[PDB]
Design a protein around this ligand. Structure first.
Ligand SMILES: CC(=O)N[C@H]1[C@H]([C@H](O)[C@H](O)CO)O[C@@](O)(C(=O)O)C[C@@H]1O
Ligand SMILES: CC(=O)N[C@H]1[C@H]([C@H](O)[C@H](O)CO)O[C@@](O)(C(=O)O)C[C@@H]1O
Ligand SMILES: CC(=O)N[C@H]1[C@H]([C@H](O)[C@H](O)CO)O[C@@](O)(C(=O)O)C[C@@H]1O
Lengths: 495, 495, 495
């Protein structure tokens, strides 16, 4: 009899962590940091709903393809949702210059206010109502983009247009016009009389003469003619003037950029649901509680950081061991109010008291190390949506290499952080147990025999009063020194 | 007499590793991970040979400059080899719009099948044979690109061309045509009669009128006229139609894109050799066995990862120490079946038995740590070839900064990994030796005297039977306890 | 009496370092590595002054807007300083094609030599003096760009111009011309007679017909006409020829690129001062001594590496503890010639001698670890200035994401390096103290009692002669063995 042991926590847990050295090492306590689930819905962003384009494309919406709903209310939006291949684009076929730049401008835009600038009924000198085509049905009749006017000769005359708009607003105006490319010479005269036409646009920044390119082309949604659209931003106190002798597709409405800020054009097939998040991905939404996730790289909002991994587990507590009679042999399921502690074994004592002078000091630096690593990735790379046309392959791939490039880097960083500080977390516990022992060993010196398993046996009488002497760094050799010098002489001369 | 020592491996090796702390530290065992050699040849890629353009440029090949060999067999290729400054490009001088994009499309292309679409002999209404020039010799005569036709007025007439090709294939067609820019008004009429011409191309995606730009230019390979080429991809079930009144350089053959996949345009001066690899660089080929290399950044195939370093050496074993009588003093050349072990010294014994209960457990986590680091760079940045024209300097440099940017990062990563896990590999060995000792010390307690060099001297009689008691965690104090309590009393009272 | 203690340095220092584990840990010795100050001036770069554009823009300078000073001396420059929004650009309004590419070419250019190529007085057939406008005042009169000529019909005639320059220099020539876009048909005839004009330019690389685009535009600095400029580099032994029938803005002077090399276009509002640096930022200059700084990302010269941090402190020495009687309790302010050492306490001795066999060996690997980390970031990402026009937003943001992307990475790297090697630096010190103890313990074995605080008490007589026996790894048990075996028997049998 008359013993004392130094040991560590153990418990029912089976959570598993990894290090540089070892795979799958069971631990008392561990915290997962990788979000891997999503809700498959398309939610609003902290109260603010997305602009859902339905089966339409940004060009369809802006130009007002008869198939796409105007947004009469002038709403703000948190992001824009476009299908992967929308069906309602340029219903009348053609091209839309610097389209992918316009889309990129939408990503920093949060609210438009549509405003009339040239009212459709103000083109006295031309036919403002025959410009419709079979390619643009609204309710089965022939129609046309709501937001632009296809001007056509009135009375076999086409008087040269010169018209101007002064932008008297505080905001930037986004303005869109177009020019018509007929398929033969006979049709050019049929529509605009003058055989040779142009479309001129002037602002202080932009000067452009546009000319009708007549070619023989396949049928797209029915026609072989084409229509090419342009666009520009008109700054406040600047004016724009158009002049043409034909082929001019004039704007009726402009778009007040009224709210800039964080936004995005997400490509997704989903539709809206009565729901809200702090983090949206194209395939659903994320419970942004954990610091990392692997659901999708193109997440927007207040999001955890994306890493290409399948799990990522911090270690916070000991390894998990029975495990009897001191630390050399494992940990004590019977310790519960700490991680490292002791075991009494006295004339009166039972055992199992914890040294939270070093257990709090360890839960101290552990949960302080824990989100100091979470915060050291606050600067991590968050990817951003961009699009490129068929003649921009090189930089599309430059952009791809760049975004995958950083994601691989930050993934490497994330993993190496966990593996390394895992190994240092466990290496800490051991040294903590191992110093508990020593704090006892350098108190009880002569008066006890090191038993080689992690316990000491007393060359004196202990009492419970004094077994707090050793826990508290209190025990003093002299007051039990003589009683021990006695008995060790007697084992020396025992049986 | 009556001793036992705890010591470690040492041997003839002189391999040197580095850490954060120290340079050039000799070790028992080490493994190099940096490939630094190449074979200076240009080999096939795992059975599949490269398309070697010889003295020609991608434009020369595609257009079929009379100097460049057609590839009649329609071969597939693993990569494309272009000289740094080929001599057979546009032999007739001009430009080739979105050339560097076309080159980039080749990088994802593995096989072409050339196919006739407008047979040279089907232009009844024009002269299909006078379009040759002194700038394009084949066998010293005047000639011209094999794959396009220089159409010229037949009989002082040039009837307006309108011709169409429906792409009835499953594959994408790559199609190339051109327009002629004469040097004076008199020559334009000399060749095409009509003073004012155009070249119109239509597909469902592309609409383009092209117009002859007459200027006065220097002589390039003899001429002052110019020729500008265009190109487009015609998707299946789409058609293309050309129409012109002159200056039209019509396609004869199109290129079926038949195999897409991994490929590349390597710039190299070398030529092919009877040889094969899994990794090709522009300056030769690589024995892809090791995980890193430093031969060249633009390597293709199944390649080790490029890092800008001169050596990179993993440490796997101990430091390298004579080194006599226990671990405090160095390692034992005489231990051979392990890394850590013991030394007998008995009434019968010699010494030098290894504790492979902790030597296998160390060769365990070492070669497991070894390629866990190799695999943690499986996601590393691999650079990709791209080209940019003289007006694309900014993004050419963006691309350069990006690729050097990641290579510096990954090089830093690679080195810090080795240095750090080197320091933890050696720090492991020491703690392994140092725990061998303790496993012995906590067995033999009273019955032996710690000699301070790493050995114990027995206060009892040992025998070989029992010196496996201490190796095997077997030795039990009581069965030799009385014989020791005897003698230590007698040194206490000896001489 | 008769003692000896093992302890460590401590001193007046209050410098604070951080690790993964703990914040704000005081240390004996530490070195700051983050430059955070600048001088707010704009200095020369190692003797070589910047080209200060004052209120002008690169286009103003090159074209020689009457408001911008020519640089008659043909100076070289280390960098170029442009205000954020200069006031002297195209005073005559228009555009300047591939402007941001030209600016990028300046960044690799260090010296121009302006040279006449078409002397203003050599246009016999046209009016070379009426081309001035109210938009370009010099000293209040009407004027025009010094470096180009606005050619205007002489005598209601405009004979077709064809003029050529052979570049007979070793250097690349930078050449700039322009074309005039009038506001109405009547003005085009007023200035150039011929109603329909063109501007043709030929080199071996460039072929271009330019055509006057007449539109109705707002007034910029007074006018509604516009002027569009072009530019090209003419390589040596190549020639260029222009021809026009009107609207031609002809070059007078060209720019010999005479010195290429490292340079930059810094945007800054500052002006020059009598001052020099090795590192310039847009907001001032940097004492490039430390390895990292956080003043500004766009620093040029021989600069420390930019990291987005507020402090970065290496730990080099111990923690900072009174701290009495051995290492278990703290460090000794009284040790001064080392970091770890001893304390005598003898029949004659006082104490406090240092073991610089392990103190030099620690100042060894510490200052070797110190700039091995500084040198492991020698490859770090240095950002580079680039500009993009309003239709290049996507790649402008690609470039921004890329540069912030690497800066976040390298900042993470920098911090993790310090935190981790800080923790290993302190963890070293402790193990160094802790091995000092042991080197003593395994010498003095039986002959001393471990006192549990870090000191030993001698079972024999020591003398100063022998207390170097223990410092020097010299002390040998036998020569004091008998005197100790005596007294320990007497404590066993003492009071
Ligand atoms: C602008 C114009 O001419 N519109 C006309 C269209 C188009 O010509 C075709 O759809 C080809 O564009 O043809 C109509 O019969 C129709 O579809 O109602 C009459 C209409 O006025
Ligand atoms: C298309 C054409 O006109 N080809 C003719 C060429 C070219 O005119 C010159 O090489 C300048 O292009 O001149 C020839 O004497 C020749 O070289 O055989 C006759 C030939 O028919
Ligand atoms: C090239 C030209 O015509 N220059 C003339 C200018 C410009 O016409 C206007 O500034 C509009 O460009 O007008 C003047 O009265 C002037 O300002 O001295 C005469 C001068 O010769």
């Amino acid at each position: 009899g008359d013993r004392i042991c130094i040991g560590y926590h153990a418990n029912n847990s089976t959570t598993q962590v990894d290090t540089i050295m070892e795979k799958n090492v069971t631990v008392t306590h561990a915290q997962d940091i990788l979000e891997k689930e999503h809700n498959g819905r398309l939610c609003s962003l902290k109260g603010v709903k997305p602009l859902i384009l339905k089966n339409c494309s940004v060009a369809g919406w802006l130009l007002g393809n008869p198939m796409c709903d105007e947004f009469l209310n002038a709403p703000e939006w948190s992001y824009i949702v476009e299908k992967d291949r929308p069906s309602n684009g340029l219903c009348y076929p053609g091209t839309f210059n610097y389209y992918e730049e316009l889309k990129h401008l939408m990503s920093s835009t949060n609210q438009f206010e549509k405003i009339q600038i040239f009212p459709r009924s103000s083109w006295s000198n031309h036919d403002a109502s025959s410009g419709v085509s079979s390619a643009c049905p609204y309710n089965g009749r022939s129609s046309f983009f709501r937001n632009v006017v296809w001007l056509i000769k009135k009375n076999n005359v086409y008087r040269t247009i010169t018209r101007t708009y002064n932008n008297t607003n505080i905001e930037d105006l986004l303005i869109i016009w177009g020019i018509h490319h007929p398929n033969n010479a006979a049709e050019q005269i049929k529509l605009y009389q003058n055989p040779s036409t142009y479309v001129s646009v002037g602002t202080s920044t932009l000067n452009q003469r546009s000319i009708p390119e007549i070619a023989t082309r396949p049928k797209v949604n029915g026609l072989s003619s084409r229509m090419e659209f342009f666009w520009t931003i008109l700054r406040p106190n600047d004016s724009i003037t158009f002049e043409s002798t034909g082929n001019f597709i004039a704007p009726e409405y402009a778009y007040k950029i009224v709210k800039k800020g964080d936004s995005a054009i997400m490509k997704s097939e989903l539709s809206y649901s009565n729901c809200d998040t702090k983090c949206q991905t194209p395939v659903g939404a994320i419970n942004s509680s954990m610091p990392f996730h692997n659901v999708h790289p193109f997440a927007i909002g207040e999001c955890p950081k994306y890493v290409k991994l399948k799990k990522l587990v911090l270690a916070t507590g000991l390894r998990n061991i029975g495990a009897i009679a001191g630390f050399i042999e494992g940990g004590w399921q019977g310790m519960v109010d700490g991680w490292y502690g002791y075991h009494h074994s006295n004339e009166q004592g039972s055992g199992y008291a914890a040294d939270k002078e070093s257990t709090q000091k360890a839960v101290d630096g552990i949960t302080n190390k824990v989100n100091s690593i979470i915060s050291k990735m606050n600067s991590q790379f968050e990817a951003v949506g961009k699009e490129f046309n068929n003649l921009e392959r090189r930089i599309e791939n430059l952009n791809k290499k760049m975004e995958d490039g950083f994601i691989d880097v930050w993934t490497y960083n994330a993993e190496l952080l966990v593996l390394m500080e895992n190994e240092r977390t466990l290496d800490l516990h051991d040294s903590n147990v191992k110093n508990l022992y020593d704090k006892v060993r350098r108190q009880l010196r002569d008066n006890a025999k090191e038993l080689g398993n992690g316990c000491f046996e007393f060359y004196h009488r202990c009492d419970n009063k004094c077994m707090e002497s050793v826990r508290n760094g209190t025990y003093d050799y002299p007051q039990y020194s003589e009683e021990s010098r006695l008995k060790r002489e007697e084992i020396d001369s025992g049986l």
